[PDB]
Design a binder for these strands. Sequence first.
DNA 1: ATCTTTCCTATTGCTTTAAAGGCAGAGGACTGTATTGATCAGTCCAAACTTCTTTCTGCATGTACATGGAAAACTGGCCAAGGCAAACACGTCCGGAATGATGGTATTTAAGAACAAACATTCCCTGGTATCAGCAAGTACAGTGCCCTGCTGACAGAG
DNA 2: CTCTGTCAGCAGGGCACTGTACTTGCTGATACCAGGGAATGTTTGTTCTTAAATACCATCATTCCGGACGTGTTTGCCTTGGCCAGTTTTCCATGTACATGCAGAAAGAAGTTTGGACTGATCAATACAGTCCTCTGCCTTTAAAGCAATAGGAAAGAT
Lengths: 53, 111, 109, 97, 97, 95, 95, 83, 83
Amino acid sequence: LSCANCQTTTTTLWRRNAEGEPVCNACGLYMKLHGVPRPLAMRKEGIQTRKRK
Amino acid sequence: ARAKAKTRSSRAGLQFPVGRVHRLLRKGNYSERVGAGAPVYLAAVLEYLTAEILELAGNAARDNKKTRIIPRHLQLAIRNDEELNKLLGRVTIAQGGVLPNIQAVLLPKKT
Amino acid sequence: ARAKAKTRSSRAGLQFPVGRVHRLLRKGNYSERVGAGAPVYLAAVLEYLTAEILELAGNAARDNKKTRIIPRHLQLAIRNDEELNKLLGRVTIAQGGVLPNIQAVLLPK
Amino acid sequence: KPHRYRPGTVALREIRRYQKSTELLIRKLPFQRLVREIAQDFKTDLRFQSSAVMALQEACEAYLVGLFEDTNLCAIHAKRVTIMPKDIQLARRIRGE
Amino acid sequence: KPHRYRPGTVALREIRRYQKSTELLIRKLPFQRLVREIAQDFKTDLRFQSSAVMALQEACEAYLVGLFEDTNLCAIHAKRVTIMPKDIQLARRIRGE
Amino acid sequence: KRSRKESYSIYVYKVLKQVHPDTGISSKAMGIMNSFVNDIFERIAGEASRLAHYNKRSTITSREIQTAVRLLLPGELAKHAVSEGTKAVTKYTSA
Amino acid sequence: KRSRKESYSIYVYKVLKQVHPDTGISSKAMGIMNSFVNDIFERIAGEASRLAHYNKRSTITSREIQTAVRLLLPGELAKHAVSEGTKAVTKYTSA
Amino acid sequence: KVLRDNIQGITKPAIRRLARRGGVKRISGLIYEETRGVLKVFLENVIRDAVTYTEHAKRKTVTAMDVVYALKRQGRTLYGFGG
Amino acid sequence: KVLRDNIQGITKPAIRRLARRGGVKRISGLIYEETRGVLKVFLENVIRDAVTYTEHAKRKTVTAMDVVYALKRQGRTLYGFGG
DNA sequence: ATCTTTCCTATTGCTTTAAAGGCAGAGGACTGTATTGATCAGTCCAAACTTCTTTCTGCATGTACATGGAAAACTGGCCAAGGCAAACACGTCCGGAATGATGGTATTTAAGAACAAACATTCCCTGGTATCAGCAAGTACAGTGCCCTGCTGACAGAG
DNA sequence: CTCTGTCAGCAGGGCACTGTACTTGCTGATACCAGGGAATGTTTGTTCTTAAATACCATCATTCCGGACGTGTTTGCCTTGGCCAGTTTTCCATGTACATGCAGAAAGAAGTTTGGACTGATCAATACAGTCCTCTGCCTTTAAAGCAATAGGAAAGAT
Ligand SMILES: [Zn+2]
């Protein structure tokens, strides 16, 4: 699955929007609070920089 | 004139504080004198160990569908790794719990 | 002029060396400074523990009809006393042997 | 007939539940009173930080849990499943306590 | 009939004899050879003081005697008198090794 | 005023971000990591001090720390820690 | 001559003569007793050094040694050693 | 002011839960008194060192550091309390 | 020069004597291999630390003090050879 | 219960080797004075502990039913103890030598100490997202009644 | 008598149904962790000094390797005895579930008390130089312990 708004495959708690499609926790909370979709620029990302055995 | 100051931690490429480690070694009354490379080596070792434990704890937290590491995740990471478990065999972690483990003979039989 | 030197052990009325203990404390990297009474106290404690162990070991040797204390007698003295055994629980005495014990279940009818 | 699980099933369920969780199993106030009583013998009119009592409780729970795993191993060794005072005594004896 | 002690009598005799004495029980030369064999894996051409090998023998026999005491306790706990490998395993597990 | 309390929290968080960019860490876990770092530091420093004292040396150099790490850490942990320590020391000396 | 190596042999022998006038002690027993004295000295000194660093104190005084003795020695030994140390310090202070 | 018989405050279900966390399926009836005695001994041993540390610093309040340190000197190192 | 199989040098009579000192009356046949394995593990653990201590001193002779330090590091303090 | 055999302990003579005592010296303890920095004493305040009060329940206690696990008794066979005889390899010493540990001198490299700048770390304040709580379906698993399928003790009846 | 047909009963095991408990998904509440700004104390740069480690050499001590001889120990084998494992039975002591009330948890407030910051002060430790005498190394002596031989008592096993 993925968020219908910003398309993250991993989230702490899947939710749904008014249309009923799945949305990630941050997007759902942002929509419920402000009435606007969460910007993809506001969405965060990162790449691992260390590894071992 | 004085050159731009550069932290020894950045010089060694570490994230941990070389200066603080050196100061603690000097104030810890461990020896009369401390070599220059001793704090760098110790900081590197500490950074490696904490990176290992954090990696394992993060994997455990991901397994539990949680985003923030908690003491339960640290306990699971430590006790599920043989080397870390041997290193920290005498240590108690607050709110860590225990590994799920039931002796085989205690489980229900079939008949 | 300097007066007649008197060892700090004599002042404290101890057999153990106060000066050597003070020097060991200073050179042991235990503290930046060392109090005057600290070596005296430590020497007194060490002397007391030595006296206790030697008394028990001598009693054990005398019970064994031996004039000189040997490691076996030290082991018998240490393991027959509760406090000393708890203090030296993790210690191994070379050539000390073990206390003679046999579990009562193993004895014959 | 009302439902009734056989002996041992709820025991296994509780084992799984309490091994899955991490909350302190002893009630806080009686343990605090016990700690204060024990400290009363050493020095009168003492005061305790809340974190100090919490640390004492955590250490006691961990120690008892470990002792109970060792006791369970000792009981299983004797071809039993019920822990008995002899099992605890053996576990403490081997550990050097 | 030739004289023969019933089983267990000479066992108790040897127990008393070896608990009374203090001399080393392992033959010195094969233990030295074993020590050298083990040490060669960590560094080639290692010189060994005689006192070092003697100390190793003292420590090893003391550890083994303690382990056998705990093993005998475990054996007696299971209502047996013969020590078995499972008893040593239990003793090591409880001791934390 | 009041005395400031120092800790390793910022450095532990930096290492966590470098390892797991998206995972967070709670305050209790951060305290546990602080305690762990302090414990390992105390162990290694004490062993290095003992090593220096045994050889009648006055300095704790990188060699003492390396030997302490080899003594305390088991197996692969010791090997990887030694590799990281040597890398850090070499990089520091070259700079 | 060889390099001097110090030991507690003569003091242990003097204490033995004080306690058991007509009893001797073998060289192996003297070595064991020397090791015992060194071990107890190390334990008490380490505990006192910790106690001094623990309250941000720079000096190890008689009170630190007394607390170390209280913490380490069990039961009756603790109070007997404390009494002996207090007596020794009282004698020393009066000179 | 005076506390008398609060060792019984370690209730039977509490010991049962502690045993369950240890993987114990069946618990003898006499286990509870033995466990109470063992806990009493352990608490006395730890609190003695904690109170000694408190008395050395001349404080009257037992702080979490003292408990952590008493646990450490007995080989029971505890993480998560400012160690 | 090299040594291959000298773990078998710890003969059955030696293990029997060690058990007898420990108070053991009856010994199972399988005990000897288990005890040999345990002794080998213990010897490797001690000798590794002893050799590390020797190497740190830049020496090539494993002195008794190195063995004493290695034993003390494992909580197995030995009296008689120190010094 | 008494006799025979084995082991253990105790006693006595020789010796040997290890501890007790004596002498030389040096390096480490001791004495005295100046310096200083660590510690002690008094005051204050704030924050953190102790005490008391009310609600509210969850949890401990008490009771009753009954199930299965601990303990005792019996059997046997097989695994280990005891003893004998041959082999071997440990123990003891003696010598060759070669390796490594100790000690001394020139030196050279690296760390302690001091002072100023500034910059990294701590504390304080805010939003916002992960985590907690509650309800409802779905799933997994336990307990149990019924049934089919096997077997076996017993009785009945043809060769 | 042999064997084969017929009854009746108890056992294993499979499967369907009911019921309980745990897991998952969704929504809503909240709390605590990440990010931004003020402050302070601690780290870095630079220079000088000095002392701890390094490199070379000499030398001696002490460990490794080999050899030879004595005999105590190890190892293989045989006999057998008694201890461990399996089976059966019993009963009591634990597990499970239900009902009640009581005190633990949480929140609020007040009291209080004491831990730590701040300032002044005072005194006890360190540094340095000079003196000397106590401890360790070496050597010699003698007595406590070890080894060998003998004798008597205690204990195990058999009749
Ligand atoms: Zn989204």
